[PDB]
Structure 1
Amino acid sequence: ITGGSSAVAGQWPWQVSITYEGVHVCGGSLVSEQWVLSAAHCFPSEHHKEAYEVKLGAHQLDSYSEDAKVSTLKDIIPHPSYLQEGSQGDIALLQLSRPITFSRYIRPISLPAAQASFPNGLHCTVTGWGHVAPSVSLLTPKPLQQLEVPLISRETCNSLYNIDAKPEEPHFVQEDMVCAGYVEGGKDACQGDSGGPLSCPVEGLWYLTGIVSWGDACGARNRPGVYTLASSYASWIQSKVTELQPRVVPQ
C-alpha cells in the first residue's frame, strides 16, 4: 500500500497474510471460520498447496504476537475462468486446514450478495503489507497499511484502462472488476497486496466489495487500482462453499 497509513491492531481483523515457502506474497480476507478469499494470481498451478501458510490476527507481520494464528491450507479453488497473466477471474477460495477461533483480532468480513451495488464515490479502504513505493517493500516490522480510496464508476475505469492505455494493459471487465483510487498518483495498492480486501462500509457494516487484483506500478498516475468485484462471484462462492452466505447489502 502506498500513500496510506498504519492501521491500529484489531482494525481490519479479516485481513490475512499469505506466505509461500515462508515468504509473504499476498493478502486475503477471512470470510468465515475456515475460508479465506484471495486472488487467483497468488496461487499459480505449479505451487504446492502445502507450501502456503496464512497468518491471521497480526498487525505487524514481522513481530511476534500472541494474538496471531497461523494456518495451513486444505484446499485452494481458483475461479475456473482464471488464466495466468490474464485479468479475468482473479479470485480464489482458500480453505484453512482447521477452523480458527475468532477474537478481537480475527473476524470475518461479510461477502456482498450478487445484487449488491456500492455507490460510485463511496470511500472504501484497502489494506495490506505490500510495497510502499514502486519496487520498495514495506519495512520491518511491517505494520499493516490502510488506504481510503473512492469507488470509481465502471464507465470511467473502462476509459482509463481500456481506451486510454496501451494494448498491453490488462483488460478491465466492467461486469466483474471495479477500480478504486486516484488518478493523482501515490495512493494505491501495490505488489504484495493482491488478494487483500477492498472493505466498503454500508450502514456501519463492512463488505468485501473487491479483492486487490492489478494496476500499474505502485501508485502510478491515471491508473487507479483494479479489484475483482466480489458480488460478481457471490453465486460462484456460495455454490462452491455452502457455509459461505453472501449478505444482502442495503440499497
Structure 2
Amino acid sequence: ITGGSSAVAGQWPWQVSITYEGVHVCGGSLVSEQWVLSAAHCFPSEHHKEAYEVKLGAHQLDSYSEDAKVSTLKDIIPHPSYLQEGSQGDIALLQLSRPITFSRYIRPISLPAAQASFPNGLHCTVTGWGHVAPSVSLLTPKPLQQLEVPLISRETCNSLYNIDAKPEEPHFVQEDMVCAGYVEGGKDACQGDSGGPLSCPVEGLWYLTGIVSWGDACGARNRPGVYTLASSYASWIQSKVTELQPR
C-alpha cells in the first residue's frame, strides 16, 4: 500500500497474509471459520497447494505474535471464469486445512448481497502488506498498511486507464469490477496487496466490497486500484460454501 498509514493490531481482523513457499505473495479476507477469499491470480496452476499458508491475526508480519494463527489450505477454488491476466472472475475461495477460532484479532468480514450497491465516492479502505512504493518493500517488521480510497465507477476507471495507455498493455475494468483511489495518484495498493480486502462502511458495519485484482498501480496517476466485486460472486460463494461445508 503506498501513501497509506500503519493500521493498529486488531483493526482489520479479517485481513490475512497468503504466503507461497514462506514468502508473502497476496492478501486475503477471512469470511468464515474455515474460508478465505482472495484473488484467483494469486494461485497459478503451477503452484503446489501444500506450499501455501495463510496467516491470520497478524499485525506485523515479521513479529512473533501469540494472537496470530498460521494454517495450510485444504482447497483452493478459483472462479472458473478466471482465464488469464486482467480476466473477470479474479476471485478464489480458499478452505483452510482446519477451522480456526475467532478472537479479538481474527474475525470474518460480512459479504455483500449480489445486488448490494456501494455508491461512487464511498470512502472504503484497502489494506495489505504489499510494497509501499514502486519496487519498494514494506520495511520490517511489516505493520499492516491501510489506505482510505473513494470508490470510482468502472466507467470512470476505464476512462482513466485510457489516459497515456500503452496500446498493447490493456487495462479493461470488467463488469464484475470496481475501482477505488485517486485520479492524481500517490495513493494506491501495490504488489503484494492483491487478493486483499476493500472494506466499505455501511450502516455502522464493514462489508467486503472488493478484492484487490490489479494491485500494482502503486500510486501512478490515472491508475486507481481495480477490485473484483464480492457482490458479483455472492451467489457462487454461497453455493460453493453451502455445498462443500454446510453449517
- State TM-score, norm by structure 2: 0.95
Residues 244 and 184 from structure 1, CA distance in 2 versus in 1: closer, same or farther, beyond 3 angstroms? Answer: farther
Deviation at 1:173, TM superposition (A): 3.6
Say whether the 8 Å CA contact 1:4–1:145 is kept in structure 2.
Answer: yes
In structure 2, the residue matched to 1:205 is 205
SS of aligned partner of 2:16: strand
Following the alignment from structure 2 to structure 1, what is the Cα–Cα distance between the partners of residues 164 and 119?
24
Say whether the 8 Å CA contact 2:86–2:172 is kept in structure 1.
Answer: no
SS of aligned partner of 2:155: helix
Say whether the 8 Å CA contact 1:16–1:56 is kept in structure 2.
Answer: yes
Any unmatched runs of 5+ in structure 1? none
Deviation at 1:83, TM superposition (A): 1.9
TM alignment of 1:40-189, pairs within 5 A = 40-162=40-162, 165-189=165-189
Say whether the 8 Å CA contact 1:211–1:230 is kept in structure 2.
Answer: yes
RMSD: 2.1
SS of aligned partner of 1:18: strand
Any unmatched runs of 5+ in structure 2? none
Superposed CA offset, 1:155-176 (max 9, x none): 2112122576333344434420
Deviation at 1:237, TM superposition (A): 1.0
Deviation at 1:76, TM superposition (A): 0.2
Residues 165 and 245 from structure 1, CA distance in 2 versus in 1: closer, same or farther, beyond 3 angstroms? Answer: farther
Moved over 4 A (4+): 243-247
Residues 216 and 10 from structure 1, CA distance in 2 versus in 1: closer, same or farther, beyond 3 angstroms? Answer: closer
Superposed CA offset, 1:83-137 (max 9, x none): 2323321110000000000001000001111000001100000000000000000
Q: How many residues align?
A: 247
Following the alignment from structure 1 to structure 2, what is the Cα–Cα distance between the partners of residues 244 and 180?
33
Superposed CA offset, 1:162-191 (max 9, x none): 576333344434420001000111100010
Residues 58 and 45 from structure 1, CA distance in 2 versus in 1: closer, same or farther, beyond 3 angstroms? Answer: same
Calculate percent identity across the aligned residue pairs.
100
SS of aligned partner of 2:244: coil
